[PDB]
Amino acid sequence: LPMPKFGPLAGLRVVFSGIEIAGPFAGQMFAEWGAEVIWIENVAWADTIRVQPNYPQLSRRNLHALSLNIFKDEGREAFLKLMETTDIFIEASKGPAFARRGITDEVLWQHNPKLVIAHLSGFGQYGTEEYTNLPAYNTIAQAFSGYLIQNGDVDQPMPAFPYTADYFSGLTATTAALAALHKVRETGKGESIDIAMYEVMLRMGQYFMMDYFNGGEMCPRMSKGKDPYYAGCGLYKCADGYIVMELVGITQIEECFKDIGLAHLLGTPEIPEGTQLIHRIECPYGPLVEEKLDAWLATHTIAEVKERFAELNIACAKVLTVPELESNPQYVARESITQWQTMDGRTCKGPNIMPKFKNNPGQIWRGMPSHGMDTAAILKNIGYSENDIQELVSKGLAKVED
Amino acid sequence: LPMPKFGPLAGLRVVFSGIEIAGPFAGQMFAEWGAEVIWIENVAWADTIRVQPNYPQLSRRNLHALSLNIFKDEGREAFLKLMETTDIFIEASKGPAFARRGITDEVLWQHNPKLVIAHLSGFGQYGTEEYTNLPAYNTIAQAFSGYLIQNGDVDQPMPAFPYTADYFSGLTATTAALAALHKVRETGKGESIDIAMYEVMLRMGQYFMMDYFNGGEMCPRMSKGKDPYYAGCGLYKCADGYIVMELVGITQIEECFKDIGLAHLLGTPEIPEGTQLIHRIECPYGPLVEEKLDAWLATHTIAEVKERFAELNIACAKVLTVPELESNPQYVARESITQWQTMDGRTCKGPNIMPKFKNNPGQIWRGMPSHGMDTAAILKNIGYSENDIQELVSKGLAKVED
């Protein structure tokens, strides 16, 4: 398939089947970095992402679009012929849906013994009858993993937003597939990967849950965006708006207490010499620290706080709104936001390729493809004749460019 | 270094320098999957994660601990000797701190031309004077990327929790390093990677921001954990507690409207045949949909809703609290939560290895190492004599087991 040679993953061949965020995010990250990535959509209906007015121009860029019925007769045979030249296949389904329909890992490996197979599901490839075959999106994974219950304000839990669990799961899939690919080079045999979304989010939520699993108590939710345990950490108000700060480190704590009028607290049983963190609940002075911190901050503008905190090596930042991003000097300097052309010939704006590879930078070479756009090209490249593909379209088993 | 042979990354050698979550998360994910991973801590002070009572038993398991002054005299030489046998080096610093201290990418490559170098920072390896050298933690990256402003309730923004941006950044580092490693096999030359935390989070926050960058408006924050745009999506109340649901799909919408008493709305200008999603703001019936949905749900128990939604292929789940996780049948069946022994000989409980590799499963083989534990072993393995290492300890340039 015609495309430029770029990035660390040039020459790698990736195929994915899945809709919305998680599966396709995993697949498309390969394309950001140079790989040849085929997006499989069903024949009768298209990916549900196409209902979003602008996002798909970013989340589906650099992709080739195949539209094929991968489970039915000649569609199935065509799909399995494609697998012979495929290095990595990402699939997102309700549990072991592929195996249930006859496309097992053993069947796939009969066509390509080196193939890396990544199964993404809500609840895993096996477990109980009750959960294994259930559909899942982001919020389902947050609910089932204890992540949702940790987010929100004290009295009101809420999901992390937007679609946080989908990105973590997709990213985990990408990472695991690349790890397995490394093993194929060193062993010459394929791998199968079982990524359950709830297990991904369970790991991302352990910072305080590890206390519960090991004798302790679970932490509360944040109060108005302040860390539930550590004073001087999270969201604060200055005289002219919101900032964030992290009061961490021996020196930072000593100079900040001095600033806020609390120098006498240094060297007490719960804040002894060398204290790197002040625990707002274990220390009797916790609420007092917050009271004086709040009052000192309300006396200063964001700019003044930034300068003093720059002097103390205290991490902080103004909370930026979306309209403030484009013209930020750091964004401009690094080209964090760029422009590209859509397939239809319109100018689209959005984030550039991330991260920055020094020797082999990624690039945007293609806008989001249309439904069935590359079908005729992909099938011809795997041995199908013009009339033979015409029969796949007529039988309802494949769709070509509109 | 003595360790079992397991996982897709057996025989890979990884070194990381960084503290807390992001850097070490990237490094330790290699160790979950079989790699030999060296954790570098400073000599005079240890990783700040050690202040957490339980989490480090999970986040630092499977690791070898080196304690060395990588920038000073014989410590520097020892570090650069280690790099000769290292495949991947992860470093987390304030901007280009390594280069500023004399350890440039060109210097590193003089010792190992195939080395993959991953630089993790808040604001990148280059940019403006104002931002590039600033310290960063999770909340700083959320603030600077527009992620924080999207999380929380309508009237109250708040960070995603816990330390969400740290895990995304660490995971991106792992993925990029593995992608670059693939290129080294196919080109025989090293790579340098510039991962700025704010650019990572900028990408994770695009779902609705793409509308703003392309003519449209930015969405509001969620109201009590309901999707800002799409009805039937997010957090709801049943008669006996919180659930989450995603009302997505042609069939799901038709049968659910029928259930809630809104069948007559189907086939109207804004809900025409084939509608996969109901937009709560573009549709005049949006608030009515929510009103009837809320009332129908309040009539039913969680269990009843689950059964009916299982009949309709509508994704949903009870919102689980932390105490409900251990004894959940899916968690038990898959061993999602397991037990292991610490270095001190105590039983520790927490998440198992994720994800599940079929042919080469990861395993927990070592608990979290002590400060300086493997120093003498690592230095001896790179050509240092017992007396020569004794001088590194005495000069304050290295620390050995306590």
Ligand SMILES: CC(C)(COP(=O)(O)OP(=O)(O)OC[C@H]1O[C@@H](n2cnc3c(N)ncnc32)[C@H](O)[C@@H]1OP(=O)(O)O)[C@@H](O)C(=O)NCCC(=O)NCCS
């Ligand atoms: C997202 C999800 C709920 C959607 O599933 P769905 O409601 O059944 O909708 P789909 O369009 O994917 O599936 C319809 C059917 O077509 C099949 N199908 C999918 N792609 C096909 C193709 N290219 N050709 C022929 N059939 C196809 C599916 O297998 C499914 O049949 P099944 O019930 O036997 O498994 C589900 O795929 C899932 O839980 N995935 C795992 C988690 C995930 O990825 N979530 C999305 C994160 S945003």
Ligand SMILES: CC(C)(COP(=O)(O)OP(=O)(O)OC[C@H]1O[C@@H](n2cnc3c(N)ncnc32)[C@H](O)[C@@H]1OP(=O)(O)O)[C@@H](O)C(=O)NCCC(=O)NCCS
């Ligand atoms: C986390 C962070 C704020 C801490 O930085 P810090 O306050 O300077 O604390 P450190 O202990 O890391 O650094 C102290 C000094 O020791 C140096 N140092 C670090 N490891 C060393 C080692 N093994 N031997 C000798 N010196 C070392 C550092 O370079 C630094 O000196 P510098 O100012 O010239 O750069 C910073 O590393 C950072 O912004 N990292 C990038 C983003 C990130 O990883 N955040 C953490 C996510 S939880």
